[PDB]
């Protein structure tokens with residue numbers, strides 16, 4: 001389907017275009033608002049669409065050199081697997097009105113948690129040389145990635161709650 005392919009490409013391109021915005025709170029702590037179009041894609045079109053949009057967004061980050069890349073496996077883990085994992089929100093898609101808020105927040109929560117889980121593992125393995133003085137690798141990664149995860153969920157929550165209320169039909173795909 002052609003409408004699908006193009007929804008996917010548009011939301012992935014929109015994620016990258018959003019990932020161009022300064023979002024650093026402090027050091028490597030970030031508010032990852034660029035996740036939002038992918039989560040929106042996932043919730044509206046289901047898992048597969050989401051994984052694919054996540055995959056596309058990730059490649060875009062890399063090929064334009066906006067990804068932080070220390071190595072093949074690290075970039076694999078953080079710019080393929082991690083953005084793809086947002087598609088997990090697709091398991092929470094609603095196909096029939098009226099749209100409930102609960103599966104939107106439950107899906108959003110779980111998908112960001114999953115992405116940041118992958119960043120947390122990456123922090124431990126590839127990013128510890130950056131840990132603040134006195135901090136082991138695990139504590140530092142939980143701090144950076146736990147906090148960033150939460151702020152991201154928070155922003156994702158604010159924006160999708162607004163969307164649920166003002167434009168609920170964004171989340172329900174129908175023909176016609």
Ligand SMILES: CCCCCCCCCO[C@@H]1O[C@H](CO)[C@@H](O)[C@H](O)[C@H]1O
Nearest residue numbers: 005006009010011012013056059060063
């Ligand atoms: C090809 C392997 C890596 C490159 C990926 C393609 C880069 C362009 C993103 O995809 C394309 O986006 C265009 C703009 O939105 C659309 O014209 C088209 O519908 C869509 O398919």
Ligand SMILES: CCCCCCCCCO[C@@H]1O[C@H](CO)[C@@H](O)[C@H](O)[C@H]1O
Nearest residue numbers: 024025026027028029030031147151154
């Ligand atoms: C919840 C998101 C808001 C975070 C914005 C903070 C940016 C970096 C941390 O700031 C610091 O905070 C310290 C403790 O308050 C101050 O003593 C210090 O002067 C200030 O540099």
Ligand SMILES: CCCCCCCCCO[C@@H]1O[C@H](CO)[C@@H](O)[C@H](O)[C@H]1O
Nearest residue numbers: 088091092093094102103104106110114
């Ligand atoms: C860390 C990986 C997490 C994977 C867990 C995902 C399983 C949840 C799927 O259940 C779903 O509940 C939704 C609302 O609760 C409904 O919209 C949907 O129809 C139903 O299928």
Ligand SMILES: Cc1ncc(Cc2cccc(CO)c2)c(N)n1
Nearest residue numbers: 028119122123127141144145148
């Ligand atoms: C400790 C630590 N520092 C930096 C990174 C790279 C990275 C890339 C994308 C998103 C995030 C979210 O914090 C982080 C990491 N995974 N762990």
